[PDB]
Point group: D3
Chain length 163, copies 6
Amino acid sequence: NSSAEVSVESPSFSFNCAHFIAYNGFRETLHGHNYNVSLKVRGYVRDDGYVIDFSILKEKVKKVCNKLDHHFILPIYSDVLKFENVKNNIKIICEDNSEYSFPERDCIKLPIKHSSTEEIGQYILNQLIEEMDVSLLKSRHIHYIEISVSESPTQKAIVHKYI
Amino acid sequence: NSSAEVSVESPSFSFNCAHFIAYNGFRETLHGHNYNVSLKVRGYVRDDGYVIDFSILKEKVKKVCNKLDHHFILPIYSDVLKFENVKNNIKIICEDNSEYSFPERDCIKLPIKHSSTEEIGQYILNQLIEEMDVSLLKSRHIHYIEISVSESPTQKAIVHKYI
Amino acid sequence: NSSAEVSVESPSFSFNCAHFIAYNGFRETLHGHNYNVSLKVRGYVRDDGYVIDFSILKEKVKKVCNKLDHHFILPIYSDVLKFENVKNNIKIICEDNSEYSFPERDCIKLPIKHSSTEEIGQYILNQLIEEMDVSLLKSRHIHYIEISVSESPTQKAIVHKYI
Amino acid sequence: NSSAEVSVESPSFSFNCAHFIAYNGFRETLHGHNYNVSLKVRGYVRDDGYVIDFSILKEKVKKVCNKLDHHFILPIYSDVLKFENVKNNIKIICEDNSEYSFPERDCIKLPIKHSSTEEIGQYILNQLIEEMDVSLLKSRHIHYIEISVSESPTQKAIVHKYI
Amino acid sequence: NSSAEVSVESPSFSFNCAHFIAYNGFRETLHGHNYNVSLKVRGYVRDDGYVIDFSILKEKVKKVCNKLDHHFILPIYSDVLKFENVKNNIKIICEDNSEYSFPERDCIKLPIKHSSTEEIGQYILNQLIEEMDVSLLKSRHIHYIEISVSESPTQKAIVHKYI
Amino acid sequence: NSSAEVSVESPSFSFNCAHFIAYNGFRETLHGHNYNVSLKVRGYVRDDGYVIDFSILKEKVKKVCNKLDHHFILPIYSDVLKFENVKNNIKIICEDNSEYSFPERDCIKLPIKHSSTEEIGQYILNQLIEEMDVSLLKSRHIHYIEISVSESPTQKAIVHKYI
Ligand SMILES: C[C@@H](O)[C@@H](O)c1cnc2nc(N)[nH]c(=O)c2n1
Ligand SMILES: C[C@@H](O)[C@@H](O)c1cnc2nc(N)[nH]c(=O)c2n1
Ligand SMILES: C[C@@H](O)[C@@H](O)c1cnc2nc(N)[nH]c(=O)c2n1
Ligand SMILES: C[C@@H](O)[C@@H](O)c1cnc2nc(N)[nH]c(=O)c2n1
Ligand SMILES: [Zn+2]
Ligand SMILES: [Zn+2]
Ligand SMILES: [Zn+2]
Ligand SMILES: [Zn+2]
Ligand SMILES: [Zn+2]
Ligand SMILES: [Zn+2]
């Protein structure tokens, strides 16, 4: 068969963030991770000799990671957390009525229900798909994209999209 | 597409064992390995934000590895070895009439024909599927499980099961 | 020469924490890291065949890491942060008057001036020296201890003590 | 399911070469890489306990890598390069009229259009398939073979063949 | 003891170059490497909490690597090579009278006798010391600096300077 | 300062052996390890541009590893084990009167008291020192040699000799 894949991975494709998981009947304490992203795309060797240039993949991964890096990840779609702006701070109130308060600029609000590695990965995948531009990918006949997001060197989520 | 995978891997998911391969017309000398196990499951992001909790996968891999660790692996289904159990020892007699004798407690008797990485993997996969409980996996809509077993950092076997 | 070293390192010797650095005229946003610890000791091969048992070093590193894991690291000796404890929360007030508030149980209060990797390392080294018991180390003629603490796979601090 | 994979990878499966990419309207400066090869085959556990012996895979990978090691890779099917023999040297003329000249003995002439990691991969895969002998693979019921070629630790190409 | 070290390493701190070693009675064929650089400095925890900021070390390493990346390394102080300018090309004549010719823009002229990993390391160390500025290092009481240069994942040179 | 170090390391510099530790009042069960060796030497950059050629180090490490690979390691100097040859077998009797019996050709008899990683490392170091030849090392002004022996990726011993 003639489809081929290229992938990029680097300790440099990272965002260092704080978070905590909360879902129904469960809340854990604030902590954080070096999240690391790798990207794979399946296409064909085109007339320039590439599936797609490594440098485009690297540039797009770096960009998405840079936006996330150095914040508390706030899942705005959460069904078990309440958020309030008080002065320059976002206040987070949990089901058990415990409270956090951070400067608004420390938080990155992501359209996700939970700050789990799977849902963060889904977010990053959609972002990368937009950054690389769907029509570029189609012109090169790239039909599948996969990202891995590790929350540590021992645990990772892998999400994908057929395009 | 909406299926997602999670995987766990660590130097800690290891068992350090002695063994030798024996099949028709071939027997190698006793030696050993640090075997290492990584586990991946394919499912869907559930309402808790996970495919499945990383901590469940880690706890189950550690348990199966712990049972194997620090033994000679005895393939009880071998077609080319004869086994005797006299007093507190297991004697192994090979086709060329060479013999080994170990204290019975030093052996872990696996229901496999050869102590190859492939066959050890198949056994580990079945064990992990039992540990994780097949009905748990089904309630979360997990449909695929894969383990990699490395006999060293340079060589591994990958076995899977669709469920 | 006759001195010998043993070291242990693993992805498992980790603590996943939130923090931010603050020193005179500088404050960064809340974020987090997978911190990883490796331990090395210099001694002599003793009559049991060891510098010291690897299992002792692993057990002691795991214990110290476990205490830190899953918290916000609070540097109680900070010269640029004011701390208040009201009801069940710790409030942190910075020089620029920005504020953070966490549940008290979310914080691990370390006797350090900054939550830098260097200062966290020094604290870990002192703890491990206490855990391993200085008189045990002396009876085995261990004269040097070194820990590396990485804040990510790309950056680390190395602190030591001659004993 | 009953199919299984075995895989071999090592820093030892490398070839260190110089090259440059040239395609329509693009030429880069001469540089080099440590190319690294990993091999995976999919088959079944046979009556000897193996998908196929690891030692066969390693032996064949090392062989192909050793042929390539320590040369300038020249893509003889290039549509943007001209090659001419002058004394003991091969002269390369680019579209911009820039020129290179190397001794003949320093070039490995590969039947590829571009010295891209993708196309080098396709070359290596064919070679490996011939070295391992297609009918041996068939007798063991091996039906899929995949190689990864990395040009550095951060970027790689993955090519495959169903057989 | 109170001195501490910080270290930075990454697949990102690389330069991908072509070269060949030539010394008395020995010349090898043109090939290439992904050279990788790691930097360690020894100093003291200062009043900001750092030996020195990781970001300064990373910034300076990347800078030096970027200058070298994607060239043929030419050792201008070679006692067994002759270099001559012809049009836009540099001609290299070896002792055996074999010849190379590259465009000028494809060579990085380094003040080294041999393009060995040792001598490239010594060059990089001096450059890094100048980039980081000797008096900044002195004001922070940094007294030792060490770089590792790997020519591949399996072999490296380590050079240092006491300052 | 002008001394420099070169080191070689590879998953290929390995011996896969069985063993068990026995010392006074302690015996563990038969198991095994992939032992991995790395070698470092400190010297000076000589007139060929090297501290010493990487290829000599690699060749010597491979040789010593190859001799050990695929055996049970038998510490002939043990003060708590008794050995007897019975027909083609070596019988090992422990303090608790438990017994092992292996074909003589499965065992490599090492002049060490315990098959600990430290004592194996000491043995390997002396062997490597002999293989590289002390006078070669002296002519190049190499004054220090260090080997690391890991028994797994998480635990290692480091032994050295000033020469
Ligand atoms: C333990 C901690 O990192 C926790 O936040 C955690 C635990 N288990 C998890 N499990 C999955 N699958 N994904 C996660 O993001 C996750 N996250
Ligand atoms: C960056 C350097 O390796 C350059 O020659 C380069 C750039 N982009 C690339 N991209 C792909 N896909 N394959 C290559 O081999 C490749 N090669
Ligand atoms: C094998 C290849 O990298 C060759 O050019 C080579 C061989 N031996 C070497 N040995 C040393 N010490 N340094 C080098 O840079 C070096 N370089
Ligand atoms: C647990 C197992 O590998 C055991 O054989 C073991 C345990 N602890 C050890 N500890 C040291 N220091 N060295 C060893 O070789 C060693 N070896
Ligand atoms: Zn988490
Ligand atoms: Zn084996
Ligand atoms: Zn930080
Ligand atoms: Zn390239
Ligand atoms: Zn080289
Ligand atoms: Zn052991």
